[PDB]
Nucleic acid binder design. Sequence first.
RNA 1: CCGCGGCGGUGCGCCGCGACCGGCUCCGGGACGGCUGGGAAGGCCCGGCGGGGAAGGUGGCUCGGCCGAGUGUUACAGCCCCCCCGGCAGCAGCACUCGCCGAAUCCCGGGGCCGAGGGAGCGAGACCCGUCGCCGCGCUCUCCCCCCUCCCGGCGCGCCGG
RNA 2: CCCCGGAGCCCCGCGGACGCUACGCCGCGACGAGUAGGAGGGCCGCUGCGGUGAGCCUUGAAGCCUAGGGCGCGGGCCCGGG
RNA 3: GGAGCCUCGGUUGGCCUCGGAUAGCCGGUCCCCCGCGGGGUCCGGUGCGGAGUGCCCUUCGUCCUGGGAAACGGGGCGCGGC
Lengths: 236, 56, 109, 199, 51
Amino acid sequence: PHCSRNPVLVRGIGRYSRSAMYSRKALYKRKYAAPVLATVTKPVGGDKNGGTRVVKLRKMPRYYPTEDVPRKLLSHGRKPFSQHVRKLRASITPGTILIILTGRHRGKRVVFLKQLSSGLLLVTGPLSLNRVPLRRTHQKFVIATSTKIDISGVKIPKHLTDAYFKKKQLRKPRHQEGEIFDTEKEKYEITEQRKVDQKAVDSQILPKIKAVPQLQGYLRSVFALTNGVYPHKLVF
Amino acid sequence: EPYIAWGYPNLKSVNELIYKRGYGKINKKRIALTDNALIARSLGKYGIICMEDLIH
Amino acid sequence: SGRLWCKAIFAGYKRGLRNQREHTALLKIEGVYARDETEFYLGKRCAYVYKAKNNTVTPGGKPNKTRVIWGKVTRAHGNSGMVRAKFRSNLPAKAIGHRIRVMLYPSRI
Amino acid sequence: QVLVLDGRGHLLGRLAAIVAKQVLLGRKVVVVRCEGINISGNFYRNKLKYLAFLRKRMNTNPSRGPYHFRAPSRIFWRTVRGMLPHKTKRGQAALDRLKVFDGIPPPYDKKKRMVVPAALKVVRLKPTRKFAYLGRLAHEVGWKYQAVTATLEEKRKEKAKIHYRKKKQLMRLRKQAEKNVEKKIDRFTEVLKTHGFLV
Amino acid sequence: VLKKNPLKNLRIMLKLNPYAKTMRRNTILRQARNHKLRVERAAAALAAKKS
RNA sequence: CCGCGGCGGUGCGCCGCGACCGGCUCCGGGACGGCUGGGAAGGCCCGGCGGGGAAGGUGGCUCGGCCGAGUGUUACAGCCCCCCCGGCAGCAGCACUCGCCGAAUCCCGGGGCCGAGGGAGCGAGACCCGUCGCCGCGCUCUCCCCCCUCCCGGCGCGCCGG
RNA sequence: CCCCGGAGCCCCGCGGACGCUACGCCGCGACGAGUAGGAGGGCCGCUGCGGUGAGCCUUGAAGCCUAGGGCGCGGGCCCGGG
RNA sequence: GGAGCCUCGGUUGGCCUCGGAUAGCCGGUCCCCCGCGGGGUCCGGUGCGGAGUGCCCUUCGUCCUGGGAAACGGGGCGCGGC
Ligand SMILES: [Mg+2]
Ligand SMILES: [Mg+2]
Ligand SMILES: [Mg+2]
């Protein structure tokens, strides 16, 4: 199961050729000179008197609807989200600083930790400083400030992934009708694993941030546009 | 003259016009030259069997 | 704790002299006056934000009297840093010469 | 949130043009010292031009007909009114933002007031060209209150000269203060000139 | 059939004219080759300036 | 009933993302051709040959402290310029953007916008589905080796064995 | 080198739509100003007749009115309430 | 101090010389004149204006404790007089 014997030159253009590839792959020397009725297909079981019984796995249906929709047309190149390729603004590098633009943690400043599987950012404005925990964000609702901490050698937990940072509650039936059922439940509880994860990560960062003078105080502060200062003019 | 602009096209011009806006007349139906099977079917009796031949 | 949106005035609709094409707002973004200063603002979310008699809902909030019409700055309109917008509904005309908020948050920065 | 523009040294229509668009974009504007607005073209030229405008009246009942305002403030208002769609609701709303004054009265006599340099005489005219003060013009066409407006402005300039002297006095002490303190603001003052002020 | 524009859509170009592949394989390589050779001139000019 | 397993149509209401294609409008990079086989330029300097403005000059006068500044004349070169012979690699339509025309002599990457509009499965003991053309490749049914090393296994973070 | 009452199917000539009111259904192109005027189609509309709806109707017909719900490009139409 | 219809716009402030433009701004006067200032001369600084609206002022998380530099500043819609 060898890798790709020609590399990529451009998306869709291999470096080599047809002819170089014939020689590389060596098509010379790799020449392959090669010149129901009664028996039931897929049923079968056991059983007592009379003899054995022939069942039928996947038995034809007990209701047809009166009309139903008729197929589609194959359509070529339409991958599900999981199989997508993930981008990242070059500005956003690990241990950089963001300004989170949208949520409740709005205008708050933050440190960027990693791009998760999803394509979301993982983020921490060390809970301690900012009041921003280990948290997902989107590239698109974040301003990649030109300010970096050196975060190279911090072992972020392998177990913290997209799958963990994912909302949890609510199933279907229960009592339902009346003045009850899951309008209560009430609170997302923080849990202890979550608190342990934070504790571990922050300690590795937290010394690193402090080394930079005033940086903690910067990371405490909140961003906002005052008079006379225009996004397009200033830099971050 | 005062109804047209005209002159001597480049090589690139003949390509860009043919590839981007090359439409056959095929049973009097303007049809886009999506494959050479179209060009050939019509012009193949002249030795013209592909977009490239057409351009030449 | 402060303002996370750049100010802009609703100039009026994209229009010829004598045919206004109501489906496209024009937006005089504050502090920008060159078809040059305005590549920042292309494709940013923007809100006509206004309040009305009856109460409404509110995302992550209790029922309010404020309402908004969301839109998007599409392209730069003529030399002096006006900008075209397009809104999920057309803007009211009541709106002329009033604030609309151009956000930061489809950022490419 | 409000423009105050010292109409002195500006050009009548040139300023009015710029004011109109500000006013149409919801900007509340105030235009002050309107008698000081000055109009290109030699004096006599413009007097006749006004006197013509006076002649325009509704023959059968002048009481209806085009009301020729004398005061420089109202004149300037008239010319700004000529660049808005003032028959519309939005046009009428626009003018309601604009606020014009002969001389400079009490809210704005202690406000810093801007200057539109694109309407300014020193820039927009050749120096050998002639022009008219809209005051003189207003005076001769019947404006009653030139002298009053002059006598009130001499007070204001005297009142202001005092303020400036005290302002200067603070500035001077502040220049002294920094020098008194410049070893215990030294590693602040250094950082405010790495990122490029104080130079 | 939808007309995919050959000049943007590589594989449509190839469908209509397969010799494109080679023509474009050349003129990536060719341009890289020459770009390298420009850096090499520039390095020799800097070395000549240092000498 | 729990499986939200497999397929099919759906979303109560308001939202957002993602990647793919179409049509646009921009941005940034690079690589080439042709010319008066570009014109000017730069850099190194050497040997000559004249002509001009006008000079470290001189001179009348003036203005300042022999020196500096301002006019005026004959004009060599000790400020330059110009022509003519003869010769060097650094040029290159040159980021020292001084003046073009282009691209089988042309490619790469990026951003904003609008749009998705169609539906080659209605079998009774064996798919509720692929896919046509094109790209190549990639792989394998051929052996080799090298490297890195993710999982796992072993040995001392280092080394050895998908 | 064998038979589809079974090759398992991208093509199948052994039998054939979910589709086929053949005045139906489906696909590709192109095009679309209009007086006078002409022609076509109107499951547009009015009143009466032969047929036909085992139609509807005092458990409420026709008409009338309706800031009720919809359909149709439109002529118009259908439902809710009074 | 409490509720409760309605109408909306807003989403840091700027508390000021006069003016000139083939000129201005600031200092300081050793010296002189006028009513701490005003006017003068002289000198010293700036002048594509940094005593700059290309500007200035203001900060934008809350608290805890326990050091340093800075330190008598702030408040009680604190209270009376000029
Ligand atoms: Mg017609
Ligand atoms: Mg007719
Ligand atoms: Mg509000």
